[PDB]
Amino acid sequence: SQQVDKIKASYPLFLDQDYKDMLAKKRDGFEEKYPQDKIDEVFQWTTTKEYQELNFQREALTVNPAKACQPLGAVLCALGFEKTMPYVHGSQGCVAYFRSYFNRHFREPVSCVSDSMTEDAAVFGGQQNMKDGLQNCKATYKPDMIAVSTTCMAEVIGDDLNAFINNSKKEGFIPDEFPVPFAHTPSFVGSHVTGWDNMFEGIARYFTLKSMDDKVVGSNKKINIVPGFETYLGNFRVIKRMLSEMGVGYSLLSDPEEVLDTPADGQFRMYAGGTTQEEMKDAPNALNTVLLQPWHLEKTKKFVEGTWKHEVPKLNIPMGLDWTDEFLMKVSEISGQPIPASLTKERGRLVDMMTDSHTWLHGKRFALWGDPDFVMGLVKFLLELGCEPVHILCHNGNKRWKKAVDAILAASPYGKNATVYIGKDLWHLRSLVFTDKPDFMIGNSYGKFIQRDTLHKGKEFEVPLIRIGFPIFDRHHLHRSTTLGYEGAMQILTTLVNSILERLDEETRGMQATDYNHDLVR
Amino acid sequence: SQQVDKIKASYPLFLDQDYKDMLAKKRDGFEEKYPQDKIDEVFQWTTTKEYQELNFQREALTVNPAKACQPLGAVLCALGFEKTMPYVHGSQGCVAYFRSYFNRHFREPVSCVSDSMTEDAAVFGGQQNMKDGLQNCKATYKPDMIAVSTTCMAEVIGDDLNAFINNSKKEGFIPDEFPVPFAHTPSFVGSHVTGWDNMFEGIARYFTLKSMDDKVVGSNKKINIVPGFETYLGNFRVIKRMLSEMGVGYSLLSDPEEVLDTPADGQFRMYAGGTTQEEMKDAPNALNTVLLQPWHLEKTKKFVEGTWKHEVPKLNIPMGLDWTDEFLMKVSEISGQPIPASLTKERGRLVDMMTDSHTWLHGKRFALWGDPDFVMGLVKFLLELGCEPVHILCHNGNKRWKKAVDAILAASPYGKNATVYIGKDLWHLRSLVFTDKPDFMIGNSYGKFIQRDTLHKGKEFEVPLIRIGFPIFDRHHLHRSTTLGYEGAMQILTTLVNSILERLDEETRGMQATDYNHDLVR
Amino acid sequence: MSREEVESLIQEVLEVYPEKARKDRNKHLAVNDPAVTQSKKCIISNKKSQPGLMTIRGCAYAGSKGVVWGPIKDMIHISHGPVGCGQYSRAGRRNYYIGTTGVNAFVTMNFTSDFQEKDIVFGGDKKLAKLIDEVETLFPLNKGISVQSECPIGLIGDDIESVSKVKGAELSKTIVPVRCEGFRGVSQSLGHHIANDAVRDWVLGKRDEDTTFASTPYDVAIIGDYNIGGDAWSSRILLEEMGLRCVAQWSGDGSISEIELTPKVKLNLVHCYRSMNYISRHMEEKYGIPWMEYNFFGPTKTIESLRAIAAKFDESIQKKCEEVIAKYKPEWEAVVAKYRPRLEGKRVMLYIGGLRPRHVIGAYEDLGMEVVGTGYEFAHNDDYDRTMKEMGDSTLLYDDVTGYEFEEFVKRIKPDLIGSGIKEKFIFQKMGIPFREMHSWDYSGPYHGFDGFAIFARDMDMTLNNPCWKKLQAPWE
Amino acid sequence: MSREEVESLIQEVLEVYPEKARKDRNKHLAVNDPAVTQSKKCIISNKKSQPGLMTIRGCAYAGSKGVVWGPIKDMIHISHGPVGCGQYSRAGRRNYYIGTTGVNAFVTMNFTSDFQEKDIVFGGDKKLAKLIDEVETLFPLNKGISVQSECPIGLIGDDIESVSKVKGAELSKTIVPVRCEGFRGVSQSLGHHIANDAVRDWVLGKRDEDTTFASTPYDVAIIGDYNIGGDAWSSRILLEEMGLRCVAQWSGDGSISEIELTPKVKLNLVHCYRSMNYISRHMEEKYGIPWMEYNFFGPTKTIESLRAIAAKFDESIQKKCEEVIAKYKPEWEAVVAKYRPRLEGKRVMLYIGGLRPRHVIGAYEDLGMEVVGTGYEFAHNDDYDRTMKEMGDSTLLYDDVTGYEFEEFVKRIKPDLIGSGIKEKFIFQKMGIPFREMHSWDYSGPYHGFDGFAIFARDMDMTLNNPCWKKLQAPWE
Ligand code: ICS
Ligand code: CLF
Ligand code: CLF
Ligand SMILES: [Fe+3]
């Protein structure tokens, strides 16, 4: 039933007595459900050290992974180029998923096509798909460039992207001059960030490999910036802002910030802004190339150094105070531009915030996850804040990265009770936050289900989630935030300290029980 | 007791069994406390309509006010001028309070002096205090200007500020040409915003009344902006940003954004930035003067119109979509500058966010309080979002303002269940949130105690607080936020929709009970 | 807008396509004539999508794992292959259930074999067996396992059928192999079929010769309701207030025991014909259980359905049918009185999957609204046969519409409201056209039944008449 | 920092002032000589603040309402006057209590008469009487009311004494008039005095004829502990573990009935001498109750205090004293072992109110730290007498320090840590000097007793050694 002036959606409708009774009858009548006491018993067991040890002996089973697949990253990279259509050669199921996954995080349109390879192409290949696909895409969506990746079907059957694209041009399906950079993006190798790197190196190749003869390092007086797989609009913005403030010439290679933030003004814009083909053609003429996320830009790095002859500086992602400082100092060195007064002041304002908030942050324990560069920056900043990054999980991390993070931990007293995990998933992490409970998790939306599980053990075991990462599906507009630079550090500090004070207010809100500490001033 | 590796502060120390038993013994042995059943009974009664009726008959008693006193506003206004020291003629207890009040909200130094009038000066007046005070202040803190207000002692005894200040100059305590603008700021009249208006008019007078003969309206090609009492740094910033983006010459009159945000770089800066004396001197040569918070700038308005001959535009505070549009269009008209593409796109991005979030915002019911202009802007934007601002409280509001707000309500179906209250306090508001329960409160930190009271009735009766206003003492760095313009609307929308979604996640986190609706995607 | 104008809209839009695509797409666009009883004579469907045109369709894995099998709550479903598919489809569909997630229910979890190169080169069957053992250890209360094949599995010649048989016998566990690889078929649709066949071959027969269940003459199964936002619960409650006993729900909030018991029922009540007609036809042929189609969208269709269903039983059921109908009358009437005036005459375009593009038309019409355009991602001609009588004359129909097509149709037709999916939503919002998600119900619902109609009405109104839509043009143009 | 250097620091800083101001401030600044036992001979105190110099001092209302009376939990305290004072002092001091706020306890609420012009012109006495009736209607469980006068009340010739007597007799209720107007005196200090006098005159005598209280040889009252962050609870627990019975706490978490029972105790234990020596002397004179000063900051002082208090009683209490001291020895020793090595040799400057500037020195020393500078806002010469022996030789002493002075002192002395109030905190943080709040305990505490030392130690460490302090200078400067 409904009262027409107070209509109930699923929650709390199904809490009405008649739905409750109905649901009880279904259970008892037809579900052959395990008794509740047995359910409680198994649940408590999954919270144990014993269960954790079995959980960590898994070899074949992954549960609640914290990574996606290559072509996802290839798509996001391609979206950052002017009037460019990402095109995934292979099966169409994939593209519906890529688009939806990004739609949900950005609450924006996400344009991407497939050439709809079916079981027939599985035995004669997808060459015809590529011919008609490229022609159809170009004519229907009028892109100035089509950036081609692959789904795992196309990888397994072995379709030769280069030859198929060359033949499409040869047989007149698209003009010879029409740019169609490509990359093989096998989902069974690495992760979404690997896809990004592969796609980016492929585009750089396409526009520079055969034209190096007339290039001269430094001749355009600019610095190239490669952002990597990046899902916060504020991160593209903060980089350009700081470089502009410095008077530094730069070229941001792969820049989706416009096409992922079009105005609702009565028209749909399929494409907006983005890196130009010219910028890619001319990138070898830069003074140098800075990688914002070096731990998933390895292929790109080899090409930039091997072919462009740039001497890519050894720089961490610019997160936190020390690493933003180093980034700016390196840019200053390369460009001959002093760090302006404005950035120096912003820096001091961040430091001021750290001094204001340090007493609530001190000693706070966190479990966290994400992509390797993001995770290491978050770890770094946490130490800068006097927090303990106790459970550090990077599903797509590697041995070399883990060593690096481990050294950053060792260099601080706050890293003493921290462990870095690679190859582990959120079901591993779930055990850790039960057996060695932190104060909070910093992670993506999948973390909410871990918070749920912890509260079921008890309120005093609940570990609240603080949403920073990708994907964030269950809050609105966090994708507008910033995690890089001083601006990003300020945003993270503010979200951390306030999540702490929120939870304290919750724990002290009980009248005549815990409200002696329900302070007006904190 | 304490375990040295896990030290407990007041919460949760005092929950230890030995403290609990001690507190029980204290209560039983010596406090002569009402039985719990009687406390529970009175509590329930305080939540009733019957109690609400008694509460609304109060004439003499005020309980938990939502305003402060004049000189507080005078101080904040003075702080907005270059190397200016706020100086409150009267008793010193007042200044300790003004300083701390702002310290806690801004987490910044707040510099202000008193001339420490005592019992003796209460019966021969504070002339000697002014002489020595002015001299001591100038010499010790080397300001370029001293801006004088009053505490209620000085007002009740009738000290004549103009005479006292003139006698101080005449007898050589400070140079004749040292600027000492003044304003009487009786605390038993209006509130803190009235203090702001008074101080501002006082300063404008000081620098212009006597040199009006050589002024020509429009000659300097700028627009003056007066911000009023403003405690979000983002609000000064966004105004300046938008006008700079429009290429509009402007003078922001009273600009504390710098001295309320100095860098922690190893030195204390007592003064920073601020509106210059030359800026105030030249102000009558502006094309016009725009009042950002007209409803507490009435006195300023008369002086600007009457003496400067500016025809102050009829503009609401630039909050929300329509009023920001209007602000921008009027500025465009006054200045000759078209609204640039940058602001148009920003406007479009706010509209996009409104479309993205409307389904969770729709019909949400709010109780809210604050200063008149801030409150009416919040009300207007809530209607634009399809929310219902059901309990609208402005302790320091007036009849004319209330009518204005009622007309705003009548112009939207979403204002149909809303009521505006003036002269009422947070104890009145507390009754309304029990008797006619909204979904959330939007208000300052005092509201936390209303959330506490509501929870005590029951979790299903809890009304969560969303912190927007002044003061905010129990969270860190929210004073950096923005509430004006498209930027401010974006922030507000984001905090509202996410507060809604946080609360839904809480209510649906119960395993097997309510978690059927604990969606990953919202 | 007339039939002349729609046929020419179609022609103009098609003018951008290259020769081959133009000729294809032309066959998948039509103007309705409710005369036509053989849709075959005016539109074609269930064909391959043209490359590069941005179809909105998914794959057979979406159809099997995301749609049919995923909702079964007390089984563990393995996304077998690389990490993508399982992660993009993790908890995106709101197939609601009651359970203790991670302990006795697993619906929102993502279990996966996370294929690496060594698995592609040497096969994943050994990994799968090991994965099964690890599942049994860490999730002891699971009541069966399904293996949902992603693209690589068949391509590389793995044999999940054999792994399932072998491990099933070793552990005395129901392990269902599903060859739902996304390269198969042309859309989600073949995934349903494949998944229906899997249920039949590996689960449905389990209690064929088992008589312990105490049956009644009033036993029914709800077939093809995935309980989106609780849709099946708000359907179930009505059937049971009518005196029926709902033995099974396929598969929203469904249990493996419910599935196994379904062959004991007296009547299969089919909501989603597209996804589960296959198994329904099977149960009729093998157990002699008849099945009928019904519709619980809006009061008109719900009332009609309760009546049709009751007629299959006896006078005591037909009597309670009228008692339920009388009970809810004032409720849905107050909903109509409140919201119809706010929606009357408004025009809607729909694009959804294989059922709702026709099935919701009645509910829109109970609020005075007009569906001036509809279409399906993956429907077959028997769906279009059912559609052309539900749609008005000279309305626009589109099969496997392209992103280009849908945008251009909307620009010309200018509907007051569009109901479609997540990949469409943000496009139309920018164009200033109110948009409701008609897969996910935009995180609202249920929409099924009398109780769902209230939410449905509230939702269409809140969005269609929202203040935000008058604000898209800056007053300085 | 030698004695000669400190003296030069003082003269140099004074160089900025006009003649009159320098002559005054020179009398309020001194270099410690712990030999000197008549503080009078080295420093002046408890005089007016010089105008315009940015004293840190509060007013008499702060001392009466904010400090002494406000904490009493089951009374309602009226800030009588304009809206400012009651609002700035609302919930700013962490005088903790147990109660149901708004029902039986009222500490963090702001009740005010919100004087308007008509009250200034015509007097507020009728408003007060009306206000009292409204209070009694809406807050029936209050057990008494205090009327805390703001600046205008006396200046306009109101008679709150008469309103209180009349209304008190009418309602049979304790109504306490307090003439604590902020123009009175020079600081918070006269506020304490006025406040003690009002307790004596209007509350403390109420049970003089009452013999129903069941007294014991071990009854004590805690006098002058306002339970900041729970300080009084973590003191109380020790006294009762020692076998004493704590009849009253003045006034943290204090009740009116406890105040009324205090004349029945055997011994008044005075922590804050400055704020409550007045009532303690009166109680000795009138009821023959002895009073003694104590100190529960840090293990050394707390052990010495327990022992001196126990010695006033019998052998059974002195035995329990030693059992308490043995119980907590390992706990505070573990705190010292962990934290002293992190803090040893560190130099602290303090500036606080009337007690803590001397009382906390022993706790700092128990962590190997050195207090190189201290001062008070509003202490009297008997406080400075107690201070000169606690402070090391050649240390700096400052009475009613000016903002300029404090800043210049710190710049030259460069302490590792500064402990002062909210108005000071953000200044010194910008200078890169670790700061701890020593009124509010920086939202932490308790600091009293053994349990308090552990928190104090944690706190001085977390702040002094925080990583943020090495990051203030950008690497390119
Ligand atoms: S199963 Fe089918 S696409 Fe019948 S694949 Fe799809 S939860 Fe749609 S129109 Mo998403 S044939 Fe169900 C459907 Fe309809 S996932 Fe849901 S909304 S009624
Ligand atoms: S059509 Fe369908 S969704 Fe596509 S793969 Fe095939 S079953 Fe799966 Fe998962 S891992 Fe990524 S998304 Fe693909 S490329 Fe390999
Ligand atoms: S020294 Fe002390 S705090 Fe000052 S007034 Fe006097 S008792 Fe009070 Fe409240 S209202 Fe405002 S702050 Fe003053 S000016 Fe009138
Ligand atoms: Fe959007």
Ligand SMILES: [Fe+3]
């Ligand atoms: Fe600060």
